[PDB]
Nucleic acid binder design. Structure first.
Ligand SMILES: [Zn+2]
Lengths: 94, 114, 61, 192, 187
RNA sequence: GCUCGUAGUUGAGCAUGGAAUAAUAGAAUAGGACGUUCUAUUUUGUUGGUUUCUAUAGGGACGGUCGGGGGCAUCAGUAUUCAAUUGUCAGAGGUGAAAUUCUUGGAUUUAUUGAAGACUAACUACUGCGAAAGCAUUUGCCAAGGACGUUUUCAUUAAUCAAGAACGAA
């Protein structure tokens, strides 16, 4: 596991076995980027990035033994620093 | 800086240990370094003013611990661990008292009372 | 412009929330092309200028 | 929970001490401005220190405010272009700021006295002992400034704390003080 | 012996027993400075080792350290050395090594403590470059008090890695180029 | 058994794969034009991009932590044994197989209630805490602590310790 992980998302609700998170990070995650806790333990990987620019959500593909119903609202999910890329890339260039 | 000396005198009269006086003067005057004011220098200043502690600070804290443990054991007679730590604390008191009598910091007649 | 039918996998507790969700998806959006599309699947920003919920049947979902 | 309660108590004590210090500062600068207006010139810092000591001696109130006003009229008081005008006003404001800094330094000298006053106020709102002994005073040829300037190791090299033990006999203490009080050894330590 | 230092020593010995499989009786090598200091200060070295380790002790010496002991020509130190049982080192008799280098050749094999030795030496930089070797307990006599050195960083790292492999082993073991018609040179 | 401790001693994503052909680039053998170079056969590969993001010991103090550590109240739960009411009917228990026992006066099994002396399932532990003995239901009170960091009136303060003492065992 990486030494430095940054808080990425906050729990919103489960959806079809996946975890929906409102992004509490300014940057956009890499596809299939692993999702951690404060204990540096992986709960899953980023499955889908969705939502408007002001309010970004992402759904996590839960791993083996990780259940979406086990988590409660207000739980924070963490991502590695190198797995974030700036939002200016997806916007069209001037 | 005779004012510094007069707070040393007053704060010794009102019953503070030299380390407490040191931390108080370092907090109050905004002293940059702990090297400037220490307990040692406060001892030298107090001796220059004709003041000296009756018993040492660490032995005073051991006696304070022993008093707290005996009060707890008086209000709780079933605690054997309290008795064990009381014996340990009094053994430390006896060792420091013997040493401080030997280096004449404590008086020769000094007996710890249980 | 599109007229689209969405099928929900379960019945909503609140009906109006669906419309609210549609109002959340109006604007600049993060989308990835589906697997069926021949376009390469990289994350892009696509603008939905205006949307309107015509009808919703919560029993028919 | 205990840590949170301790932090709240510390914050309350800090803001109470801040309020007390600001009240004393504004009262002192007001009476100092009145005394400067009556005197017509700058006031010495010794008079301000004496006024601060007098206000520390008696608990401050309206009666103590009248007493401070009487002390400002006491025998101690009797014993004692346009751009240029703007610059002179700025210099007067700087002198007032220096006087306020002197009052702040005087309150810093009584900062633990202010803490004791705040503790008394907290006890009023709510409503062993380390003992020293007198001994023979010997400065050992060192004043307080040179004690503060010297290192702890250098002072211990000069003389140890166990040498002037409180209950050491007078003969051994006199023998140690005679050897320490040599001018050659003191000069060597000062050069060191 | 106080209970706090004994407890700390017991925790360190538990670390050495779990990771590096140290077993009672502990095999302790002594150095010649320690023999001289125990001779002059009249310290009972096997009793001190039995007190510090809280277990049975087996004391050894090499050729080079005891050879330097004859070079010091101290009869009491030679006698004190020769009560301890003998463990030979493969070094030349005519040109013996330094006691530090000899005791490292005995202890440090390929960067690890293969023979599970405990080193009781007074020399200091020997103790530093034995702290570089993981799983080597260090003991020394200072001011007539025998003190076991604290656990080194290498030993703690080895213990952490050992627990990590405990989590996944044992019973937990699962068991290209563009088309030529696309890029064409001029006629 | 553990600890303290005296005498003494020591130190102080866009339809896959194969065959043939074409094209392209390289490497070999052999040859022309004037060592340079190109020109015939073998062999080795390869078959354009973007869909707008575009292409040293022993003590003390302070700080933030931490623990199935101790004691006293308090709140639950779990399983046994006994007793009392139903329902049912010929076995139950145990063993290698039996046997001592309980049993139409109803044993065993099921349901409910009461009493007693106890323990805190999984998690969970040879590495957590405690000097040992030992220590995990909930909520309060009391005092004590370990490790880490900053340091100390800091060594005639320490280490070995017969006697003796506290706890435990008995
Ligand atoms: Zn050798």
């Amino acid at each position: 596991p990486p030494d430095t992980v940054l808080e990425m998302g906050a729990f919103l609700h489960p959806c079809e076995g996946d975890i929906v998170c409102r992004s509490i990070n300014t940057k956009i995650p890499y596809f299939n980027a692993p999702i951690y806790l404060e204990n540096k333990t992986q709960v899953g990987k980023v499955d889908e990035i969705l939502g408007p620019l002001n309010e970004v959500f992402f759904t996590i593909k839960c791993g083996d033994g990780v259940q979406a119903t086990s988590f409660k609202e207000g739980d924070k999910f963490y991502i590695a620093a190198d797995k974030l890329l700036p939002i200016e890339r997806f916007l069209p260039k001037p | 800086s005779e004012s510094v000396i007069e707070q040393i005198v007053k704060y010794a009269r009102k019953g503070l240990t030299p380390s407490q006086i040191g931390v108080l003067l370092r907090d109050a005057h905004g002293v940059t370094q702990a090297r400037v004011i220490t307990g040692n220098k406060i001892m030298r200043i107090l001796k220059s003013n004709g003041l000296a502690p009756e018993i040492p600070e660490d032995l005073y804290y051991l006696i304070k611990k022993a008093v707290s443990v005996r009060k707890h054991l008086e209000r709780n007679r079933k605690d054997k661990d309290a008795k064990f730590r009381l014996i340990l604390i009094e053994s430390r008191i006896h060792r420091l008292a013997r040493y401080y009598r030997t280096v004449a910091v404590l008086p020769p007649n000094w007996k710890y009372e249980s | 412009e599109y007229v689209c039918i969405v099928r929900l996998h379960d019945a909503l507790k609140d009906e109006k929330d669906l419309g609210r969700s549609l109002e959340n998806l109006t604007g600049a959006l993060f989308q990835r092309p589906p697997l069926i599309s021949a376009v390469k699947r990289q994350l892009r920003v696509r603008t939905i200028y205006e949307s309107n919920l015509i009808e919703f049947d919560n029993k028919r979902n | 929970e205990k840590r949170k309660i301790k932090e709240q108590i510390k914050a309350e004590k800090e803001t109470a001490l801040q309020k007390k210090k600001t009240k004393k500062l504004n009262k002192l600068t007001d009476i100092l401005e009145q005394l400067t207006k009556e005197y017509g010139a700058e006031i010495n810092a010794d008079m301000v220190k004496k006024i601060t000591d007098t206000l520390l001696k008696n608990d401050f109130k309206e009666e103590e405010w009248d007493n401070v006003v009487a002390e400002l009229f006491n025998e101690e008081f009797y014993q004692q272009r346009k751009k240029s005008k703007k610059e002179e006003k700025l210099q007067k404001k700087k002198e007032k700021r220096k006087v306020n800094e002197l009052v702040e330094n005087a309150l810093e000298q009584n900062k633990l006295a202010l803490i004791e006053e705040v503790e008394k106020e907290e006890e009023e709102r709510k409503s062993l002992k380390f003992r020293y002994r007198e001994v023979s005073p010997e400065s050992f040829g060192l004043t307080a400034r040179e004690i503060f300037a010297a290192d702890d190791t250098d002072l211990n090299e000069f003389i140890g704390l166990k040498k002037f033990a409180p209950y050491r006999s007078k003969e051994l203490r006199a023998k140690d003080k005679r050897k320490v009080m040599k001018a050659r050894r003191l000069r060597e330590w000062r050069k060191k | 012996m106080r209970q706090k230092r004994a407890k700390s020593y017991r925790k360190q010995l538990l670390v050495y027993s779990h990771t590096f499989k140290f077993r009672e009786p502990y095999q302790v090598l002594v150095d010649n400075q320690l023999v001289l200091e125990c001779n002059n200060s009249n310290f009972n070295l096997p009793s001190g080792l039995k007190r510090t380790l809280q277990a049975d002790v087996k004391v050894m010496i090499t050729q080079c350290c005891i050879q330097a002991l004859y070079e010091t020509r101290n009869d009491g130190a030679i006698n004190l050395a020769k009560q301890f049982e003998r463990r030979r080192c493969n070094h030349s008799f005519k040109d013996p090594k330094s006691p530090a280098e000899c005791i490292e050749s005995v202890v440090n094999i390929s960067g690890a403590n293969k023979h599970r030795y405990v080193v009781a030496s007074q020399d200091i930089d020997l103790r530093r470059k034995l702290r570089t070797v993981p799983g080597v307990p260090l003991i020394h006599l200072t001011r007539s008090v025998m003190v076991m050195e604290p656990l080194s960083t290498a030993s703690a790292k080895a213990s952490k890695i050992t627990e990590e492999q405990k989590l996944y082993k044992g019973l937990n073991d699962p068991n290209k180029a563009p088309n030529p018609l696309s890029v064409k040179k001029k006629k």
